[PDB]
Each structure stands twice: as C-alpha cells, then as structure tokens.
C-alpha cells in the first residue's frame, strides 16, 4: 500500500506525471459536417483516448493494488465520466465551445448536427462554465479525475476498504492544495463540497451520454470499435 505512504505533494506530482497526452482529431478543416460524420470523429477520438486512459489509470496510486477484475470494473463504470471531465477541463478557456481536440472545437450549434446530442453539449458547457467560475486548478482537476475512477463503481471487503483509504488520501490532497492556496478552513470545506457536487453532475452527463451512444450504435449511424462496443455493453 504505497499510495497510503505518499505525501500530499507526492500525490499531486504522481497524478500530474500520469496525465494522458492530448490527442488530435482526424478532422479535415476544409470539409463540412454530417451526423454520421460527426459521430465518426467523436468516437474515433474517444477510442484512441481510451487506450491512453488505461495507462493513466495504472499510474493512479492504489489502482494497481486491485485485482485485474476490479480494475476492469472501475474503468467500465467510469470511462465516459473521465472523458467528459477531461473535455470540460480542456474547454475551460473557450467559453461556449467544447475543445474535443485542438482541431475540433465545437460550438453548441455544431452539436445540433447529431440527433439528441445538443442537450448533452449544453450540460458539458455548463460544467465548463462552472469550472471557470470556480477557477478550478490543474492540481485540483487531476485529483477529481482520480476520485471519479475510484468512486464510480465502488458500490457496484478488504478491496472496498483499500479504495476508501485511497479516496480519503485524495481528499487530504485536495484540502492540502486549498490550504496551500491560502483558503480559510471554512472556505476549504466549502470548495471541497462544491467540487464533489460537480461529480454528481458529471455522473448525470455520463448516464445520458451512455444512452445516447447506445442509440447511435443501434441506428447504425456509426461503426464503433470493438473496445467501445465492449465499454458500451458493460453499461447494459
């Protein structure tokens, strides 16, 4: 249980070091968008990102302590939440747009291109705006993303208790960051609550996005990779 030994600062450096690369869309700037075409880009993107997410997860302290089985389960539950919080973070600096990739920055209107998607785009933009409002910091962001990984399937044991021990350490790390930033004790507790309440909304978006992805899969608007079909199937 090395994750238990880490200091606040070492937890932050570990998570920062573990950050996945920012990937590119295959998108060609000159060519116009369709619904099968828009879903093709988004899902091609997601599928490449998934491979890097797995490497990242393995560098989240405490994650490699778990059985392969539990690791599979946590990633099946959390993967869309993790892609969405990454998305929201990348977009913080582009009010009104979603930076899916540096070459694919979409306005909410570009989301009307895909049936049923605009409603989820709206929620993603609102989250981005909330992060911007709070002035969310990179160090806080990586703690939140690790909390999503470890929390999103812990209720779906010595294993359970380890996960909760690790979660308590990431909580200690967020609070450390806020105290280092000069926040009063009252302000630290308030900000911690604000941040964790946002995970509730990210869970909500993931749920909606998962049912939207399934509806696209059926309608056959887009062919999905084997891995995506598998990550999609675990939710049913």
């Amino acid at each position: 249980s090395l994750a238990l030994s880490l200091t606040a600062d070492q937890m932050v450096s570990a998570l920062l070091d573990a950050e996945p690369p920012i990937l590119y869309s295959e998108y060609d700037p000159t060519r116009p968008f369709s619904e099968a075409s828009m879903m093709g880009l988004l899902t091609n993107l997601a599928d490449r990102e998934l491979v890097h997410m797995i490497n990242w997860a393995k560098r989240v302290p405490g994650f490699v302590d778990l059985t392969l089985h539990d690791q599979v389960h946590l990633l099946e539950c959390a993967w869309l939440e993790i892609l969405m919080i990454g998305l929201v973070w990348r977009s913080m600096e582009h009010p009104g747009k979603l930076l899916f990739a540096p070459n694919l920055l979409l306005d909410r209107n570009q989301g009307k291109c895909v049936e049923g998607m605009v409603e989820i785009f709206d929620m993603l933009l609102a989250t981005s705006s909330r992060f911007r409002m709070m002035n969310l910091q990179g160090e806080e962001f990586v703690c939140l993303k690790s909390i999503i990984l470890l929390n999103s399937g812990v209720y779906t044991l010595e294993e359970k208790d380890h996960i909760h021990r690790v979660l308590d350490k990431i909580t200690d790390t967020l609070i450390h960051l806020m105290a280092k930033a000069g926040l009063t004790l009252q302000q630290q507790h308030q900000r911690l609550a604000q941040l964790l309440l946002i995970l509730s909304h990210i869970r909500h978006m993931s749920n909606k996005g998962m049912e939207h992805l399934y509806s696209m899969k059926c309608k056959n608007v887009v062919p999905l990779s084997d891995l995506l079909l598998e990550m999609l199937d675990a939710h049913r």
Binding site: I54, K58, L68, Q71, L75, L227, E230, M231
Partner: peptide
C-alpha cells in the same frame, strides 16, 4: 478476453 482485460495486463 475482454479487450480492456488485455489492455490492462499490457500497460
């Protein structure tokens, strides 16, 4: 033999 299984073992 889930793909995710193989990926976790291999990275």
């Amino acid at each position: 033999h889930k793909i995710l299984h193989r990926l976790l073992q291999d990275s």
